[PDB]
Amino acid sequence: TSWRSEATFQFTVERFSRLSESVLSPPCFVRNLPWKIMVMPRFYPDRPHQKSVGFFLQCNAESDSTSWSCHAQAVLKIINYRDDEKSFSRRISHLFFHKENDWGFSNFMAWSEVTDPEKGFIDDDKVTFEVFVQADAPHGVAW
């Protein structure tokens, strides 16, 4: 159901090594709003050797409405395919709204580590991301 308070969904990015810009999952509905996983390579000019995986949760970004807001908790996880006990996750808490409709980690993990076959996150050039999102009832959506 769309109005559920929480959900866990995964997003697998294929040909991960070739990613150059943000890739987005299809929407997953929680608390009557659409949520997406956004993944992108990131780097900063002062640390050109430290390219990272950027990993964000995005809420209701297809809307340009300035009225909506939704506070959510989430666990942002990259799945270790070799050992499910070696997956890596980091927690967030954020009021989502138009000006800040995503939240997560620009420097989630080093790109060189996620793409290292020996580390267990990448297989057949595929990396799987997962979000467990626990959202509050939104405001500014229903009349």
Binding site: S22, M38, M40, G54, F56, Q73, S89, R90, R91, I92, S93, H94, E100, D102, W103, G104, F105, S106, N107
Partner: peptide, 15 residues
């Protein structure tokens, strides 16, 4: 084991 506090290093994407 989950130890790192919520939001450590968190931000918007800037997109």
């Amino acid at each position: 084991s989950v130890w790192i506090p919520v939001n450590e290093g968190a931000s918007t994407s800037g997109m």
